[PDB]
Amino acid sequence: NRTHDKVISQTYVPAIANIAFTHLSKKYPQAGLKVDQLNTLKEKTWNDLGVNIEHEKQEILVELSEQIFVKESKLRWVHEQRQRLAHTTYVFSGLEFQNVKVGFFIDSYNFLLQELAHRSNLYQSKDIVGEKSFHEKHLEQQTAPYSGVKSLEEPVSQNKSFINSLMRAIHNH
Amino acid sequence: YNHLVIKYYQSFICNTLINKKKLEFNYILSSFKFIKELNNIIIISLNKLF
Amino acid sequence: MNNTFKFLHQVISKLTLKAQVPNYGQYSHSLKRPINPKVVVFGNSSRAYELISSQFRNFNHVNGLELKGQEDNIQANKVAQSVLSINDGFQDGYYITDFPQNSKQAERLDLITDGVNLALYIKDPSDKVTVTRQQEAIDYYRKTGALVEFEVDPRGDLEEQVKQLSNQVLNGYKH
Amino acid sequence: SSKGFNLANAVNTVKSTLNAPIKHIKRNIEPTGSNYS
Amino acid sequence: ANFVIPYLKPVADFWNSLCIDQHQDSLFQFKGQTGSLGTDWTSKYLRSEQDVYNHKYLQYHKRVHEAPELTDVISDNVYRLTLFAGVERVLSVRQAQAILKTQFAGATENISGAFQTVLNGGIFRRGYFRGALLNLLQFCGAPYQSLIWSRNSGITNQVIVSSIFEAFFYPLDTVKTLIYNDVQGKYKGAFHCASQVVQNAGWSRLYAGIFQKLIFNSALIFHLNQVWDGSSQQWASLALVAAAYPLLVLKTRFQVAGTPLALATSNEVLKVNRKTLYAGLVPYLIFNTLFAYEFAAWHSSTAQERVIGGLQNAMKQFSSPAAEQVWSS
Amino acid sequence: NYLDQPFVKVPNANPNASLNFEEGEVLYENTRLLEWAKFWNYSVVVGYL
Amino acid sequence: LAFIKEANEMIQQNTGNLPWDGGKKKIFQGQANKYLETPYYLLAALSGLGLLYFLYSGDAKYKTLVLTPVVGIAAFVLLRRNQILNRVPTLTELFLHKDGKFVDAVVSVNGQLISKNDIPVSTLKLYRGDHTVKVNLNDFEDASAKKFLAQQSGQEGVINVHFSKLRNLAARNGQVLNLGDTEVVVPFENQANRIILKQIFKGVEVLPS
Amino acid sequence: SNVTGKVALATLGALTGYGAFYHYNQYLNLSARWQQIQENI
Amino acid sequence: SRIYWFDFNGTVNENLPLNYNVLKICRNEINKLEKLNENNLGTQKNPIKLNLSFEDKHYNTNNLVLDLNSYETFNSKNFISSIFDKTFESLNTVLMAPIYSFLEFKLKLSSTKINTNHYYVINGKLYITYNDSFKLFTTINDYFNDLNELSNTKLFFLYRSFNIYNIKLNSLVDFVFLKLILFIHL
Amino acid sequence: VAIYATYIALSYINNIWKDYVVRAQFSKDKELLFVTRVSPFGTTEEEVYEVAHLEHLPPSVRSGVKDLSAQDADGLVDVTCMSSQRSLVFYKGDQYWN
Amino acid sequence: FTAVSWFSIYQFARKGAVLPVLREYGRYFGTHRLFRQYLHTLVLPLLYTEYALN
Ligand SMILES: CCCCCCCCCCCCCCCCCC(=O)OC[C@H](COP(=O)([O-])OCC(O)COP(=O)([O-])OC[C@@H](COC(=O)CCCCCCCCCCCCCCCCC)OC(=O)CCCCCCCCCCCCCCCCC)OC(=O)CCCCCCCCCCCCCCCCC
Ligand SMILES: CCCCCCCCCCCCCCCCCC(=O)OC[C@H](COP(=O)([O-])OCC(O)COP(=O)([O-])OC[C@@H](COC(=O)CCCCCCCCCCCCCCCCC)OC(=O)CCCCCCCCCCCCCCCCC)OC(=O)CCCCCCCCCCCCCCCCC
Ligand SMILES: CCCCCCCCCCCCCCCCCC(=O)OC[C@H](COP(=O)([O-])OCC(O)COP(=O)([O-])OC[C@@H](COC(=O)CCCCCCCCCCCCCCCCC)OC(=O)CCCCCCCCCCCCCCCCC)OC(=O)CCCCCCCCCCCCCCCCC
Ligand SMILES: CCCCCCCCCCCCCCCCCC(=O)OC[C@H](COP(=O)([O-])OCC(O)COP(=O)([O-])OC[C@@H](COC(=O)CCCCCCCCCCCCCCCCC)OC(=O)CCCCCCCCCCCCCCCCC)OC(=O)CCCCCCCCCCCCCCCCC
Ligand SMILES: CCCCCCCCCCCCCCCCCC(=O)OC[C@H](COP(=O)([O-])OCC(O)COP(=O)([O-])OC[C@@H](COC(=O)CCCCCCCCCCCCCCCCC)OC(=O)CCCCCCCCCCCCCCCCC)OC(=O)CCCCCCCCCCCCCCCCC
Ligand SMILES: CCCCCCCCCCCCCCCCCC(=O)OC[C@H](COP(=O)([O-])OCC(O)COP(=O)([O-])OC[C@@H](COC(=O)CCCCCCCCCCCCCCCCC)OC(=O)CCCCCCCCCCCCCCCCC)OC(=O)CCCCCCCCCCCCCCCCC
């Protein structure tokens, strides 16, 4: 009943739950939506709580995008928030969460946030420098300049010879 | 119904923007009659059969 | 989201991300650097200055201490104008010092310039003015997640400190 | 008009290619903690 | 036998047709005699052995003394169009790289950089084969109509006809160049690119570089005739076309200018750095030498003599080395 | 029968409740190994065929 | 140098820091989404004709008899969805006057540019959430359509439909802005001056110049 | 798509006109050859 | 012309490397102090005085009127009549290209890189000529590393300037997977 | 012969590639290590290990230390899981390490 | 052999590497080591070929 699979990061789940519960309590003061009840609220459905999440979904998404700051994303905060808002609204426009639990909505939003962060990081660790690719190494090697022959460039009478001048023009161009 | 509502909303927005005062019902009801008749006859046939 | 579908979703997402950023798996390292790097540097120690000079050789300095006294909006606008251009030398990186001094200025600059690419703080025990001057800005950058802290020991190894700072700033760069 | 082929770069790449599998060969042929007496 | 072999049989048949002599197999498929000697297997094999050179000669004669066939011309130039279609795109990118943005997109200003720029989009419509169908259409156009209207003609007449047809079909060349140099998928197709060009600039925008394309085409036709004849002056003509190559480079740059795909305009293209005029000259010469157009309809008398002499020399092999010289035959 | 050991209990099929499987931070990452393995495996398969 | 100039212009456009372009200053730059509809219409017509020909002849297979209706239905649904998505008024550009109290806009409707002027900033309002759209059934001249809409809505002649059910194909790629009396779609992927944009959307009037 | 339609129509017209000219020339040549063949026969 | 001394009345912070604009101004004043002749300005006791403002030190340039994604407009210059001049100039350029190459090769023979000097000592710090300004020079390896970094930036600018909001396919994939999971939950 | 040759080849290629580590990530409490390794077809395969079990063991033969890949700055480090009797191979290059 | 040697010498001289064979400068005309290496690479193999054939 419990596998050896890494669970999605829960760092922002408390913040998402707090923001959503605050916004929903602004409309349903008696709903009893509190952060301390997340462990028990996630097991109930919106119908049981008498809350129509469909109407407030867009406002919840906007508030979450404007409030939550993710430091794990590779994009600056403004771009990250705008991209998160667009992605979340597009994904949730076709999803009806009314008949499912609050935990499903919270986990879906957290998964979207984590996937956006991973895509921003290019599905690679942000704290690992990594190794350059073959193309990067080749481009750096090609961009590296050519030193040439310093002996021919050295100021000497012998270097004024026609043969030496030809060699310098051929090898130090 | 959702498609019809969206088409009506878009037509109203466009007519207000352009000062036309007439809704494009030809576009709002693109295939409403056909879809409704097909669904109704299918449902009636299924009810008669089963 | 689901254990059974996690692998398939990851594979499909990796395949699709190439459409947005072609050859991302081959140019991931280079992409770590932004197009127009904007850095805000906190720290006024001698070792901090040496590290800044070593790390930002190809960047342009922006002394924000000269803007003290003017209102936050004007200061932010001037900083944005300074750091939203590329010189003939093709140096697109700018690092600011002694600015912002408060959360209002920090937020104004971020809104004008779409955010600062990096906020590098060098905690040097031999420094006692940075915390007194720009604590609010440091707190704002910590909140926004653009803050990178690199503690420096004055009696440390300069080369190792420079290498660590370069790696940390490269990792912390944001688009 | 950036320059293209360079024999020195080619030789360096060949050396890197030939030296790449040395670590793997060493790891494969090295001893381990086990002593199957 | 009912679900795999029926679908797999055509593949094996195509493989065998490619890897076996179709004429020899057809000859062997008929067994017996009707009243004439020479239908046995031994006699058929002896005939089929020389039938290769006989059919080569007959095909060459058809391409010269009969109206040209588009299928035959495409078969002759299959490699230049089928497998190495992207070579044209990479050559165009190299030629126009002087005023392109490729050097800022993980590419170098060299043939390797052009190849990498072309291949970064894959092999398909956005990659190596981007514009392959346009290249095929252009080949089926002026280069083929010119053969039709100038079969068995001199160098001057061939050049004039080719110039006329290239002028007639030039806009396709400009569209193909723009598609080749479109590395960000700005244009969704040939029609989209042409529509954008016409909407932004006038119809004359499609005829940029025509007068520098025509002269290079004349030089290329001269070199093709020289190499077909096989005279020693083929190297001099190769040098001449190498010298005229900057005309082709300027044509490509003019076509690629005046658009978001390029950093320069028509006026600035003319005053471009002179050190990059011969961009991709050696790659272009190598590609042309390896896959020169096999237009047998334009082969002169000397070229036909060379081909027939080679065929006869190959045909002479069918004599017994140790045949006895007898007083009475 | 073989699982029903006389003196010692066999390990539970599920992980201990103490363990938490929440992801932390990445220590090591060499993604190009996947590409190298795919290349080598495909090459050996093609050669063997 | 040419690339440096182009990059500087791109950075300025992305940051939305354009100067005053004469009488008005551009503070928004957005683009609409285009979807394929002619290929789907052609595919649906081909599927219908093929089904009719198969029924007339009688030489078809069960496999194709199953597949062709499915392909035709999918093509028809995709065509309807793409038509609805394309015919969505999407705000393309917005300019503010020098006085800061008037705004002009240009919107795209299925690739057609429509220009609206004399829009006081006090009337602008960005819908953070899903608003409500009012539909008047009395306007409809089709009895069957009116009856169907009334039955589905379960309301009076004037029916209010929440925008949550409509955002799937109405504003799935943007927010909803109120340009006075009309409503437009503001895409998320756009270049705009955020400082002025937020104030005008909230309705506050910026200072002159 | 007015510009695209005009461009496509112009291309079709040019190709069709070239085809008409080629077919007219071929028809003249074939008629002359057929008359010569009939006379010879 | 290597050693020169500049003095700023507190308007330039020397604790950090000088800005590109500041170095450009210094070069533009040295190219006058050299060519126009010298009143013995630039020594420690007789330095060059400068009062640099924030705009001068920071602002890059002006005339940002380039129109992105634009096509040159024809049919107004009478291309039919003007193409002759362009063709003639192209022919002249093609004819002269071998001659220009030969002349440049001869110039290389008669010229050497060491002939020109590009090193200047300012405030006891060595600088090397850079495009239109100066660049601090400390070590050959450091200079080569700086050149490599500049080349890398120029090369990967376009790749790094990718579209953040082009996430249609990713959003579609996420939506499909979450809708399947929602069906499972229902 | 064909079936078993193909099976043996694929299985032994997978076994050879199993030792190498593609990715390693600690848990939130740093109590477990999730390791992504190579699959038979070159994809990612997940496994879990315990940091306490993980250990770097010296070679059984004491004269073979000089022959270890770890002698090279860009060699390989062989980390042994003492519980699962498995080996984890990591590149010594700092580019691959957090 | 001459072509390969000339190509290698040219590439290594472009990269700044010159084999330490022959004097750096000539005793009489002061010809450069690269030029004399080219001359030797061109001449010596021809003489060796002639001697071997003879
Ligand atoms: C004897 C008589 C001869 C007579 C003729 C002589 C002619 C001489 C001509 C002059 C030659 C001068 C020498 C230098 C030339 C260099 C090339 C050059 O000039 O080009 C410039 C340019 C230089 O490159 P660069 O990036 O600018 O700079 C290079 C770096 O500086 C370099 O730095 P780097 O770090 O990049 O180094 C690259 C490379 C440097 O190395 C080399 O490149 C040297 C290679 C030497 C050997 C080459 C042999 C093959 C050569 C080709 C053969 C065919 C020729 C046909 C010719 C025409 C015939 C009609 O480094 C390596 O060595 C890499 C390691 C791997 C090497 C190869 C390993 C082989 C292993 C073999 C054994 C395998 C295991 C077997 C056992 C197990 C069981 C099987 O090169 C190119 O751009 C080349 C482009 C070639 C394009 C070819 C056409 C492609 C078409 C693609 C079509 C795709 C279609 C897809 C369809 C899909 C449908 C689904
Ligand atoms: C070390 C070695 C092992 C040691 C231990 C061994 C222990 C004993 C194992 C005994 C296994 C059964 C042996 C049966 C021998 C053949 C009997 C026979 O005459 O039946 C054919 C017989 C054809 O006779 P026919 O109608 O006179 O046609 C004459 C034609 O010349 C020919 O017909 P056609 O030309 O019209 O059609 C050509 C071709 C058309 O070919 C195709 O359909 C294309 C390819 C289809 C997919 C192939 C997948 C291959 C990948 C691995 C699959 C693993 C097993 C999957 C099992 C799925 C079902 C649970 O059709 C076939 O030949 C049959 C299709 C292939 C079916 C193979 C997959 C199903 C196996 C079912 C039995 C095993 C149950 C599960 C065992 C545990 C598995 C973990 O089939 C029919 O009754 C009509 C077709 C529909 C029913 C097929 C029934 C199964 C046929 C099995 C074929 C032989 C392979 C069996 C083993 C597969 C791997 C485990
Ligand atoms: C093989 C067996 C059969 C052999 C037959 C014999 C061979 C010759 C047959 C020739 C006849 C074929 C039948 C007729 C074809 C007709 C095509 C046609 O009309 O298309 C038009 C064409 C289509 O429009 P478009 O699609 O928008 O543009 C093309 C795209 O750019 C797309 O171009 P792309 O180059 O980017 O394409 C990349 C390529 C990427 O893929 C590849 O290239 C892969 C290559 C792999 C290697 C090759 C291996 C060997 C072949 C294997 C084949 C396997 C089967 C393939 C089956 C494909 C599906 C059928 O494929 C694609 O991605 C294509 C995009 C798909 C949509 C469009 C094409 C649909 C498919 C048609 C295929 C037909 C092929 C037939 C011949 C066989 C070709 C092989 O448009 C134009 O050409 C417009 C030109 C406009 C020029 C500017 C005009 C300006 C105004 C002019 C004013 C004039 C008056 C001025 C007066 C001045 C004062 C006097
Ligand atoms: C087998 C190995 C190779 C395999 C290749 C792959 C093949 C695969 C199958 C086919 C498909 C692929 C097709 C090719 C793809 C590209 C390959 C590639 O990478 O190559 C490019 C690659 C260079 O590309 P890159 O690295 O990008 O270029 C670097 C720069 O970007 C510069 O590039 P750029 O484009 O900017 O050019 C500017 C130009 C700038 O320079 C100029 O334009 C100088 C202008 C000076 C003007 C002076 C004027 C003075 C006044 C006038 C005096 C004369 C006229 C007087 C008249 C008076 C009376 C009227 O630069 C040059 O001139 C130098 C360019 C490179 C020269 C390469 C020479 C190769 C020689 C090979 C050995 C010797 C021949 C052996 C033959 C026998 C073999 C058995 O070429 C090579 O390195 C070698 C490639 C292979 C060579 C094949 C041999 C030549 C065949 C054709 C010509 C035959 C001789 C004809 C004359 C003699 C007859 C007796
Ligand atoms: C990939 C192939 C999978 C085959 C599965 C086979 C299962 C064997 C079970 C073994 C246990 C014993 C069963 C009883 C004995 C079976 C004997 C036997 O093998 O007879 C087969 C029977 C023998 O044919 P035949 O006697 O030679 O008559 C020749 C006539 O031309 C035939 O023309 P006809 O008009 O007389 O056709 C009669 C038709 C009448 O049908 C019936 O047999 C009764 C009705 C069954 C319901 C489905 C009818 C087919 C409608 C289209 C598929 C709908 C999706 C659901 C399919 C569920 C599985 C059938 O029978 C069929 O052909 C039924 C199968 C056709 C399937 C075609 C689509 C392939 C993919 C299917 C799976 C897709 C994923 C499903 C996931 C789960 C969804 C819940 O039919 C076949 O040959 C079936 C295999 C055909 C393979 C080649 C297809 C054409 C080339 C590929 C086209 C790919 C693109 C287009 C399709 C894309 C996907 C939609
Ligand atoms: C059959 C003819 C075949 C000809 C083949 C082509 C190559 C050879 C001829 C080439 C000629 C044109 C070359 C281009 C010229 C460009 C302009 C220029 O600046 O010159 C480039 C350059 C000189 O320019 P540089 O910048 O002044 O460089 C000076 C460096 O010291 C030079 O340093 P290095 O880097 O060159 O190295 C020194 C040099 C080695 O040079 C030595 O110092 C070695 C001396 C060995 C002496 C052995 C005992 C001789 C006993 C008396 C023999 C009497 C004649 C017997 C004849 C028998 C029948 C054939 O080379 C080597 O050590 C490496 C190669 C290994 C030795 C292989 C030598 C084979 C020579 C085959 C041709 C011999 C022709 C003899 C003609 C008659 C002479 C009377 O010329 C050469 O590199 C070619 C040198 C040819 C040999 C010179 C021998 C001088 C000592 C003669 C002693 C006996 C007579 C004394 C008379 C005293 C007054 C009464």
From TrEMBL, chain C:
The modification N-formylmethionine is found at M1. It comes from the Eukaryota. This is Uncharacterized protein. The lineage of its organism: Eukaryota, Sar, Alveolata, Ciliophora, Intramacronucleata.
Automatic annotation (TrEMBL), chain D:
It comes from Tetrahymena thermophila (strain SB210). It comes from the Eukaryota. This is Cytochrome C oxidase subunit Vb protein.
TrEMBL record, chain E:
GO terms for cellular component: membrane. It is a multi-pass membrane protein. It is found in: Membrane. Its main location: membrane. Transmembrane segments: none annotated. It holds the Pfam family Mito_carr. Solcar repeats lie at residues 145-234. Keywords: Membrane, Repeat, Transmembrane, Transport. Belongs to the mitochondrial carrier (TC 2.A.29) family. This is Carrier protein.
TrEMBL record, chain K:
This is Uncharacterized protein.
